[PDB]
From Swiss-Prot, chains A, B:
Binding positions for AMP per the UniProt entry: R328, N355, R360, F382, F465, D471
Residue positions binding Zn(2+) 1: D10, H12, D59
Known partners and oligomeric status: Homodimer.
Cofactor: Zn(2+)
Enzyme Commission number(s): 3.1.3.35, 3.1.3.5, 3.1.3.89, 3.1.3.91
Binding residues annotated for Zn(2+) 2, in chain numbering: D10, D59, N91, H194, H217
GO molecular function, one term: 5'-deoxynucleotidase activity
Gene expressing this chain: NT5E
Organism whose genome encodes this protein: Homo sapiens (Human)
Top-level taxonomy: Eukaryota, Metazoa, Chordata, Craniata, Vertebrata
Clinical condition linked: Calcification of joints and arteries: A condition characterized by adult-onset calcification of the lower extremity arteries, including the iliac, femoral and tibial arteries, and hand and foot capsule joints. Age of onset has been reported as early as the second decade of life, usually involving intense joint pain or calcification in the hands.
Identification of the protein by name: 5'-nucleotidase
Intrachain S-S bonds: C25-C31, C327-C332, C339-C352, C441-C444
GO BP terms in the entry: adenosine biosynthetic process; ADP catabolic process; AMP catabolic process; ATP metabolic process; calcium ion homeostasis; DNA metabolic process; inhibition of non-skeletal tissue mineralization; leukocyte cell-cell adhesion
UniProt KW Nucleotide-binding keyword: yes
Sites annotated Transition state stabilizer: H92, D95
C-alpha cells in the first residue's frame, strides 16, 4: 500500500508568490511559491495518486503584512481552500498569544491541529480543551494513518504562549500517544511537528512505532541528486535514521516560505512496515501556473493590504541583504542599516547589537528601489522594541563569544553590529573565538575606535528580545547593569529611511574573520 | 641701534578673536588673537620701544566670512587702523585674481605692499605698475631700514594670479634689489615674504646683505624655551642661519591665524651689522584685553556678516576636526564628513578623495552644536567644485603614494577619503608606502570592499583643484580617463548637513598606518 505525503513547513505568511529570496514578487515571470501555485501542484498529484496526505509542520503564522493585518484568519482560510489534512503547531502560532491562536486558527480550521507535548494548565485548561489534539487517525482510502504532533520545547523562549502552557520533552510525550495508536491497531504512524531537524532525527530514532517524521523549524533543505535552486541540501531526501528497534525511518523537511512542496512516497506492507520511500521537494517556480480560482481569492484579500504599499517611505539603490545565509554567517548590509537606524534614533549611545535571526527578509532594490511599510513588515514582523542597556566590557565579550559559539549551523544568535569592530578566529575553541573587539568611544569629542575594556561599562542599543536573554544570551539578562525600554523596531527603521530619503548601506568590515 | 620687529603672517581673515583652534569664538573668556587684541599688544610695545616696525608676511586674504563678504576691504581697513609698516604679498592675495587685489587692497593700503619676484607682463604691466613695489626704504627714528618683499613661486598652482604675472625665483630676484639698497647706503635690510620656512632659510643663506628674514606660508611656529600653547615649535626663535658670507641671520615666522604676534629685537651697530637678536612670538590670549576702539569698529563691520549665522543648517554632537595637525597626518572626521557629503550628493560613484590642506578650519560642537553658513565658510572658503573623474587603478595607487611621499611635513596633499580603505607603511620608501588599498564596488548589488585592481577604472569624486593636478597630483591631471564638473563645494556639504539634521562623523579606520 503506497502513501504520498505532500508537506509544507515554515511558510511564514508567504501566501502570495515571492521573489526567489522570498521577498515581495516584483518580476512576476520568475516568481515562486504562493498558495495558488501550491494548489495547482497538489491538485496535479491528487489526480495522479490515490493515497495523498497534505501536511503542514507549523509556522504558517508571522512573516508578511498578510499576518500583520489578518492575524491568522488568512492561514485558516487558505489552508482550508488547499484542503490540508493536518497541521502541527509551531512556535510562531503563539506569537499573538493563545487568544491569537484559538480565535483565528484553532476555531476556523477544517482539519485537525496537533501537538502531543503541549499541556494546558490553570484557567486555560478548560478554554483550550479539544481545540488542538495530541493525534488524529485519518482515513486514507481503505486504510487509516495515525498522525501525532509535537512543538518545540523552546517555544516559551521564542514566542508568547503565556504561563498556562507547559512544553514537555517531545520524545517523552510522543511515546504514550504512539503506544495508544498501536493498541487501536493503527499500524501506519506519521510524527508531524515543529522542533527542528536535530529533534526530528532523535524522534525517528527513539519513538517506537513512528514510521516517518515530517518536520520544520530549522528551514532544512533536503535533496537527492542535483538541487534545482540556490538552496544547498543539508542531506538526502528523505534523510534516513535507523531507529533503536532497527527500522529505516525517513525524515523529511521542505525548507521554508512555500518555495518547495515536500513530496514523499512510502511503500507500506499490510502490517504498516515501511518497505521503501523516495521523493524530493518540488520547486514551485513559474513553470507551474498559479491556480486561477485561488489567485482571484488571494487578489480579493490583497485589496485591504494595498494601503501598506501606497506610501513610499524611501528608496534603496542597493540590494538590502536580510537573507539568513548572510545575516547568520557574516556582516550583512540589512543588519548595518537597522543598527544605524537604532543609533540614529537614540542620538551618548555609540554601540548596537542585533541578532541576525531577528532579520526576517531581504528587500530588493529593482522596484525603482521603493521601500514601503509592507517591505519593512517582512524584515521586522515581531513588533519588538529597540532598548538601551548598560553592559560590562566582560559581559559584551561573553555575548560576542556566544554569537559564534556554535558557528556554522545558521543559528539566530549571530550578531549584526553598529559602532563595533569585531574580529573572530573560528579555528579557536568556543568561548575563545573573539580575537579583536574595538568599540566607538562615547567619552570623547571625536568618536574613534579603541579596544573594548573588560572593567568598563557601555550603553548598547539592542532588541528587547536580547535584553530578556533571548537566543541564549543569558549573560545579558543576568549581568546587565541597566535596562530602559525603547521605541518600536519597525518605526525606528521607518523614521530613519524617511530621513535618509535614499539609502545605500555597505558591508564595511564591522565583522571580520581571521 | 636696536630695532623691534613685530610681525604677523597667515592671519587668514581672523579679524575677530577666535577659539584656541582658530574657529569661531564661542567661549569669550578663553578666546585668542583678533586685530583688537593685536592692537593692544602692539600699542604696549610702541610705548616701551622707540624703533618699532609692524610687518605682515602675507595671506591676510581668505579664511572667514569677513573675506567672503568684504573681499579684502576689511584687510586694508583693519591693517591701516593697526598702522602696519609694510606687507609682503602672499598666494591668497591672488585668490580673487589681480582685480580682487588691486581694487580692495593695493589701492586702499596706507603702507607699502611688496614683492620683488612678481613681474607683470602684457596688458597688465601698465595697470599694476607701482601698486606694489620690490622694496621700500623706511625711516625708523634717526635711521633707515630697507624692506624687500617676495612671494611663493608656487602661487600660479595655488591661487588665481592670471596669465600676465610671472613668479621668478626668489633668490634671483632678491639679490639685485638688495644690491641696489647697498648702493643707496641702506645698511639695515629685512627680507619680508611668503614662500615658506625652507625658502626663508635659503634666502637667509644666499641673498648677500639680508640681515633678517620675516616669513610665512608654512604656518611655522618657532619658540625659545617652553611653548605657551598647543603649538609644538619647529625650532628656536629666531632660527639662525649662517649665510655663505659668514653672517648670523635670524629667520622668524609666527604660526598663523593671528594667535601670536612675532616679536624680535635686533641689535645693530652703526654699519648695519647684526650684533645680537632675541625674542619669541607673544600668545595673544584673554590676559591681553582687546582694544575698545578697535572692537567697536569690528562690531560695526560685524553687523552685515550676521545674516550668515542667522540660519541654522544643522547640528553636530561631535567636535568636527578640520585642524591641519589631524587632516594632514591621519583620518580626520571633518574629512570623512565632507567625503560623505560628496558621495551623497552624487547618488554609481562609490569613491571620494579630498586633499587635507583644502580643509581650512574645525567646527566646535559646544555652541549647542550649531552649524551656520559662517562655520562652513571657514572650512571651505575657496568656492571650488566637487567633480567626477574616471581613474585607472594604477593612477589611483600613484595618487595614494603621492599622498604620503614626503609624510611628516604638514603638507596639504595628504588625502581624506570616502569608500576607500587605505593602509600605509611609512617605514617603506617614498612611492612604495601603500601596503593595502581596498575600494567599495560599484558593479555589485551589495557594496563591499575589495582590493583595488591596477587594470580597472573607477569613478572618483574629488575637488576640481585635484582634477587640475593641484598639490603635485600630476598623475590625476595627466592620466584621468574622464572629467565632469560638479557642484559647489560649500553647497554640497551644506545640503548634506541640512538632510542629516544632526551629524556625528567618526574616525572609522578608512586610513590606517602599519
Ligand atoms: C520579540 C519576540 N521574539 C523574537 C524577537 C527577535 Cl528580535 N528575534 C527573534 C524572536 C524569536 N526568535 N527570534 C530569532 O529568530 C531566530 C529563529 O528563527 P528560525 O531559524 O527561522 C526558526 P523560527 O521561524 O521558528 O523563528 C532565533 O534564533 C532568533 O534570532 C516575539 C514577540 C512577538 C511576536 C513574535 C516574536 F517572535
Ligand atoms: C581652488 C583653488 N585652490 C585650492 C583648492 C583646494 Cl581644495 N585646496 C587648496 C587650494 C590651494 N591650496 N590648497 C590646499 O592648501 C594647502 C596649503 O595650505 P597651507 O600650508 O596652509 C599654505 P596656504 O595658506 O598659502 O594655502 C595646499 O597644500 C593644498 O592642499 C582656489 C580658488 C579660489 C580661491 C582660492 C583658492 F585657493
Ligand atoms: Ca508501522
Ligand atoms: Ca646690514
Ligand atoms: Zn519558522
Ligand atoms: Zn519555528
Ligand atoms: Zn596661508
Ligand atoms: Zn601661503
Amino acid at each position: 500500500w503506497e502513501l504520498t505525503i505532500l508537506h509544507t513547513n515554515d511558510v511564514h505568511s508567504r501566501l502570495e508568490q515571492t521573489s526567489e529570496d522570498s521577498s515581495k514578487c516584483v518580476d512576476a515571470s520568475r516568481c515562486m511559491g504562493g498558495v495558488a501555485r501550491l494548489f495547482t501542484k497538489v491538485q496535479q498529484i491528487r489526480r495522479a495518486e490515490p493515497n495523498v496526505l497534505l501536511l503542514d509542520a507549523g509556522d504558517q503564522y508571522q512573516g508578511t503584512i498578510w499576518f500583520t493585518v489578518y492575524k491568522g484568519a488568512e492561514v485558516a482560510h487558505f489552508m482550508n481552500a488547499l484542503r490540508y489534512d493536518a497541521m502541527a503547531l509551531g512556535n510562531h502560532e503563539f506569537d499573538n498569544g493563545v487568544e491569537g491562536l484559538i480565535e483565528p486558527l484553532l476555531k476556523e480550521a477544517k482539519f485537525p491541529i496537533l501537538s502531543a507535548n503541549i499541556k494546558a494548565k490553570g484557567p486555560l485548561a478548560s478554554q483550550i480543551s479539544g481545540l488542538y489534539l495530541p493525534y488524529k487517525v485519518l482515513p486514507v482510502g481503505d486504510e487509516v494513518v495515525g498522525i501525532v504532533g509535537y512543538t518545540s520545547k523552546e517555544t516559551p523562549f521564542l514566542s508568547n504562549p503565556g504561563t498556562n502552557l507547559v512544553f514537555e520533552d517531545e520524545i517523552t510525550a510522543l511515546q504514550p500517544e504512539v503506544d495508544k495508536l498501536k493498541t487501536l491497531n493503527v499500524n501506519k504512524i506519521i510524527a508531524l511537528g515543529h522542533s527542528g531537524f536535530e529533534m526530528d532525527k532523535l524522534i525517528a530514532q527513539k519513538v517506537r512505532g513512528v514510521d516517518v517524521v515530517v518536520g520544520g523549524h530549522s528551514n532544512t533543505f533536503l535533496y537527492t541528486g542535483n538541487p534545482p535552486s540556490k538552496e544547498v541540501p543539508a542531506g538526502k531526501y528523505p534523510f534516513i535514521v535507523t531507529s533503536d528497534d532497527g527500522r529505516k525511518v525517513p525524515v523529511v523537511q521542505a525548507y521554508a516560505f512555500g518555495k518547495y512542496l515536500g513530496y514523499l512516497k512510502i511503500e507500506f506492507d499490510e502490517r504498516g512496515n515501511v518497505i521503501s520511500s523516495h521523493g524530493n521537494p518540488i520547486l514551485l517556480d513559474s513553470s507551474i501556473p498559479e491556480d486561477p480560482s485561488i489567485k482571484a481569492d488571494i487578489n480579493k484579500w490583497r485589496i485591504k493590504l494595498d494601503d501598506y504599499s501606497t506610501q513610499e517611505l524611501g528608496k534603496t539603490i542597493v540590494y538590502l541583504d536580510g537573507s539568513s545565509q548572510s545575516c547568520r554567517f557574516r556582516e550583512c548590509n540589512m543588519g548595518n542599516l537597522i543598527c544605524d537606524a537604532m543609533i540614529n534614533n537614540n542620538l551618548h549611545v555609540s554601540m548596537c547589537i542585533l541578532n541576525g535571526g531577528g532579520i526576517r527578509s531581504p528587500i530588493d532594490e529593482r522596484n525603482d528601489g521603493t521601500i514601503t511599510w509592507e517591505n519593512l513588515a517582512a524584515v521586522l514582523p515581531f513588533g519588538g522594541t529597540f532598548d538601551l542597556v548598560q553592559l560590562k566590557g566582560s559581559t559584551l565579550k561573553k555575548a560576542f563569544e556566544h554569537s559564534v559559539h556554535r558557528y556554522g549551523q545558521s543559528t539566530g544568535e549571530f550578531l549584526q553590529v553598529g559602532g563595533i569592530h569585531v574580529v573572530y578566529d573560528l579555528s579557536r575553541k568556543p568561548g575563545d573565538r573573539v580575537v579583536k573587539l574595538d568599540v566607538l568611544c562615547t567619552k570623547c569629542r571625536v568618536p574613534s575606535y579603541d579596544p573594548l575594556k573588560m572593567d568598563e561599562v557601555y550603553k548598547v542599543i539592542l532588541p528587547n528580545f536580547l535584553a530578556n536573554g533571548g537566543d541564549g544570551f543569558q549573560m545579558i539578562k543576568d549581568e546587565l547593569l541597566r535596562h530602559d525600554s525603547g521605541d518600536q523596531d519597525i518605526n525606528v527603521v521607518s523614521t530613519y529611511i524617511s530621513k535618509m530619503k535614499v539609502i545605500y548601506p555597505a558591508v564595511e568590515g564591522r565583522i571580520k574573520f581571521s
